[PDB]
Scaffold this active site. Structure first.
Site, mmCIF file in Angstrom:
data_model
loop_
_atom_site.group_PDB
_atom_site.id
_atom_site.type_symbol
_atom_site.label_atom_id
_atom_site.label_comp_id
_atom_site.label_asym_id
_atom_site.label_seq_id
_atom_site.Cartn_x
_atom_site.Cartn_y
_atom_site.Cartn_z
ATOM 1 N N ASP A 51 3.984 -14.072 1.687
ATOM 2 C CA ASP A 51 3.089 -13.287 0.854
ATOM 3 C C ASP A 51 3.506 -11.815 0.806
ATOM 4 O O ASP A 51 3.133 -11.026 1.672
ATOM 5 C CB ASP A 51 1.660 -13.426 1.395
ATOM 6 C CG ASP A 51 0.608 -12.831 0.464
ATOM 7 O OD1 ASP A 51 0.965 -12.298 -0.599
ATOM 8 O OD2 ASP A 51 -0.589 -12.911 0.789
ATOM 9 N N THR A 52 4.210 -11.437 -0.264
ATOM 10 C CA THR A 52 4.616 -10.036 -0.467
ATOM 11 C C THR A 52 3.414 -9.135 -0.758
ATOM 12 O O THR A 52 3.502 -7.918 -0.647
ATOM 13 C CB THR A 52 5.621 -9.895 -1.621
ATOM 14 O OG1 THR A 52 5.022 -10.352 -2.842
ATOM 15 C CG2 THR A 52 6.895 -10.692 -1.329
ATOM 16 N N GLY A 53 2.295 -9.735 -1.145
ATOM 17 C CA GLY A 53 1.066 -8.994 -1.378
ATOM 18 C C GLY A 53 0.208 -8.778 -0.146
ATOM 19 O O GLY A 53 -0.892 -8.252 -0.250
HETATM 20 C C1 AB1 Z 1 -4.728 -16.681 -4.364
HETATM 21 C C2 AB1 Z 1 -4.884 -16.169 -5.777
HETATM 22 C C3 AB1 Z 1 -5.137 -17.071 -6.815
HETATM 23 C C4 AB1 Z 1 -5.263 -16.615 -8.117
HETATM 24 C C5 AB1 Z 1 -5.152 -15.252 -8.380
HETATM 25 C C6 AB1 Z 1 -4.906 -14.344 -7.352
HETATM 26 C C7 AB1 Z 1 -4.814 -12.872 -7.661
HETATM 27 C C8 AB1 Z 1 -4.781 -14.805 -6.045
HETATM 28 O O1 AB1 Z 1 -4.541 -13.921 -5.024
HETATM 29 C C9 AB1 Z 1 -5.618 -13.171 -4.483
HETATM 30 C C10 AB1 Z 1 -5.363 -12.670 -3.080
HETATM 31 O O2 AB1 Z 1 -6.229 -11.956 -2.597
HETATM 32 N N1 AB1 Z 1 -4.222 -13.028 -2.462
HETATM 33 C C11 AB1 Z 1 -3.869 -12.613 -1.114
HETATM 34 C C12 AB1 Z 1 -3.421 -13.820 -0.267
HETATM 35 C C13 AB1 Z 1 -4.438 -14.945 -0.260
HETATM 36 C C14 AB1 Z 1 -4.144 -16.164 -0.874
HETATM 37 C C15 AB1 Z 1 -5.073 -17.213 -0.892
HETATM 38 C C16 AB1 Z 1 -6.305 -17.044 -0.287
HETATM 39 C C17 AB1 Z 1 -6.598 -15.825 0.340
HETATM 40 C C18 AB1 Z 1 -5.678 -14.773 0.356
HETATM 41 C C19 AB1 Z 1 -2.747 -11.563 -1.111
HETATM 42 O O3 AB1 Z 1 -1.535 -12.131 -1.641
HETATM 43 C C20 AB1 Z 1 -3.042 -10.300 -1.916
HETATM 44 C C21 AB1 Z 1 -4.070 -9.350 -1.294
HETATM 45 C C22 AB1 Z 1 -4.060 -8.079 -2.151
HETATM 46 C C23 AB1 Z 1 -5.018 -7.012 -1.686
HETATM 47 C C24 AB1 Z 1 -6.304 -6.982 -2.197
HETATM 48 C C25 AB1 Z 1 -7.185 -5.986 -1.804
HETATM 49 C C26 AB1 Z 1 -6.783 -5.011 -0.896
HETATM 50 C C27 AB1 Z 1 -5.490 -5.031 -0.387
HETATM 51 C C28 AB1 Z 1 -4.603 -6.016 -0.799
HETATM 52 N N2 AB1 Z 1 -3.770 -9.021 0.092
HETATM 53 C C29 AB1 Z 1 -4.661 -9.101 1.082
HETATM 54 O O4 AB1 Z 1 -5.824 -9.447 0.916
HETATM 55 C C30 AB1 Z 1 -4.132 -8.687 2.436
HETATM 56 C C31 AB1 Z 1 -4.446 -9.671 3.574
HETATM 57 C C32 AB1 Z 1 -3.952 -11.079 3.228
HETATM 58 C C33 AB1 Z 1 -3.821 -9.198 4.890
HETATM 59 N N3 AB1 Z 1 -4.579 -7.310 2.756
HETATM 60 C C34 AB1 Z 1 -6.021 -7.157 2.997
HETATM 61 C C35 AB1 Z 1 -6.153 -6.068 4.051
HETATM 62 C C36 AB1 Z 1 -5.463 -4.800 3.567
HETATM 63 N N4 AB1 Z 1 -4.114 -5.077 3.107
HETATM 64 C C37 AB1 Z 1 -3.694 -6.295 2.760
HETATM 65 O O5 AB1 Z 1 -2.514 -6.466 2.468
#
Ligand code: AB1
EC number: 3.4.23.16
Lengths: 99, 99
Positions: free
Chosen positions: B25-27
């Site tokens: 997960d690059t995100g």
């Molecule tokens: C899964 C999905 C399906 C359809 C559409 C979308 C956009 C989808 O993705 C939504 C999603 O939140 N995916 C996460 C991983 C995911 C996939 C499936 C279920 C649940 C989660 C992750 O990759 C991205 C998301 C981005 C983010 C959002 C708000 C603040 C900061 C960062 N990153 C985070 O939440 C991270 C966590 C994982 C340590 N995070 C949160 C603490 C601060 N910094 C940080 O980096």
């Protein structure tokens, strides 16, 4: 381009006159942007993140430019804290993970 | 390996002799794994993303093998919907995005 992961992979995206900063996100199935009045039909949808779900609007066949690469496809709009480019569009610009 | 994004980039990881499936997960800034018992003194932590905040346990200097690549770093444990390998460990195994 090659993009390292020492910081968040944030890039400039363009959609219909609007420029935004978005995360290249391999953990996201789909693309979600906050606050924008896209044209055309949409349908409600729920997407899951680390804390639960948010409600979004799904717009289909929306042209978007990402790092000078043209794409077109589904764009979700809703209260995401960060704009996210997901796999549906990453594939379209030829993005892979490499190690 | 090169991993394309038509499917979720789920790979096998090994931690404490346990095999698990996790998302590259690059995100994600951090690595977060589903509930499990790890040895060591963890620190309570909260993380917030899409859908809000969860409580996690932060373990430091934990060895994890990702597709045969060894990393030793911070691992958060809590009620994440899916096991997530974030940038802190992706950089250790030399993972980049390319297009
Ligand atoms: C899964 C999905 C399906 C359809 C559409 C979308 C956009 C989808 O993705 C939504 C999603 O939140 N995916 C996460 C991983 C995911 C996939 C499936 C279920 C649940 C989660 C992750 O990759 C991205 C998301 C981005 C983010 C959002 C708000 C603040 C900061 C960062 N990153 C985070 O939440 C991270 C966590 C994982 C340590 N995070 C949160 C603490 C601060 N910094 C940080 O980096």
């Amino acid at each position: 381009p090659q993009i390292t992961l020492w910081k968040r992979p944030l890039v400039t995206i363009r959609i219909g006159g609007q420029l935004k900063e978005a995360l290249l996100d391999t953990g996201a199935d789909d693309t979600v942007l906050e606050e924008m009045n896209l044209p055309g039909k949409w349908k409600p949808k729920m997407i899951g993140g680390i804390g639960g779900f948010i409600k979004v609007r799904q717009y289909d066949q929306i042209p978007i430019e990402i790092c000078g690469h043209k794409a077109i496809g589904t764009v979700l709009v809703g209260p995401t804290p960060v704009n996210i480019i997901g796999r549906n569009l990453l594939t379209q610009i030829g993005c892979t993970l490499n190690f």
